[PDB]
Amino acid sequence: STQREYVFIPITNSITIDVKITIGGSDHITNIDERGIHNVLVITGYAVDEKNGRLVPTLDPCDYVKGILVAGTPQQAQSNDFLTLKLPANKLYLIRKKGNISDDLKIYIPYSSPDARNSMKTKPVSISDDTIVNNIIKEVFDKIYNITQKEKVKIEKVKEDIKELFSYYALEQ
Template sequence: MASGAVDEYVFIPLVNDVNYEYNEQTLTLSKNRSPINIKILGNKHITKITENKNKENKNKVDINNILVLTGYAIDENSLGLVHTLDPCDYVKGILINGEIKQLAQGLSKQEIIFSKAEVMNKLYFMRKSKVDLQNDIKINLITDLITQPNPVRKTNYRSLKIDNKKKIEGITDLYDIHNDDAINNLVEKLNDIVNYYSI
């Protein structure tokens, strides 16, 4: 059980056909239903996306600590995570310093608290880089609210295909990436490294 101060984080899944918008310290995910609103609490994001300042790699971005949640698939309509218990299922996304302010109907919040000493050991990160955590962390997952037992169905493998960079404008604004070439590079890299299972 965690004691003392706890920093709050939200797992933001990276999936197809979602609009990510950022305005007035709020990241909004919208698709077919009511939007999901995440209030940003600070810039202590565990997932890092930065413009590369190196001359040779100018207009490129560096991405570190993309979180892979195993044993989960995502409902692509509701954007809620479904716990399948299958270790082959996974969803990839970013871990940001924030709290869930609004969820669409049918979604709920699952909270998991990690000791600051175990975050980098217990969680599976792609492109792992060191994170200096001052406190234990609470991760909020957006999950499907199952009011009665539903059978876990077949999952489907998906590759991320960002066909319009405006869709991820909220992510580029959140990480202060405004150079057009750098945004194009981010789209290219996310399309290359992000895939997931849907249900």
């Protein structure tokens, strides 16, 4: 059918080495369509674990992480750490939704143990201080997408829309 993987966008660079396939298939729900990013997924209650970057699943609805989802397979020696699961594409909190759904898809999500060893003083953060948008164009929007520098010129578009769209919660301990 259709398998994808949801990768997060933090202020940290804990993304470059955990993945095997970037595209793989022939379609990507997340898009870059001459306006900005489309079909961004947000997950409630999960808080990033940037040191060994994964989403620690908390049950606080006020916490959230939003990222992109592109097809592939995450470095087969897995399924002991990640959360992989299929859904009918409609119970996804997909924001800036442009495209429709196949109402079935199996997506891998970076999971981490709940970490019952500290007090989870989660903390909200967003992307600013443009220095760290350089590397976010470097390692998520080039390593994965073939569109950058190939079809579209408006890249400061995907500068401000990425540092305006994306926000999340960290654990800071």
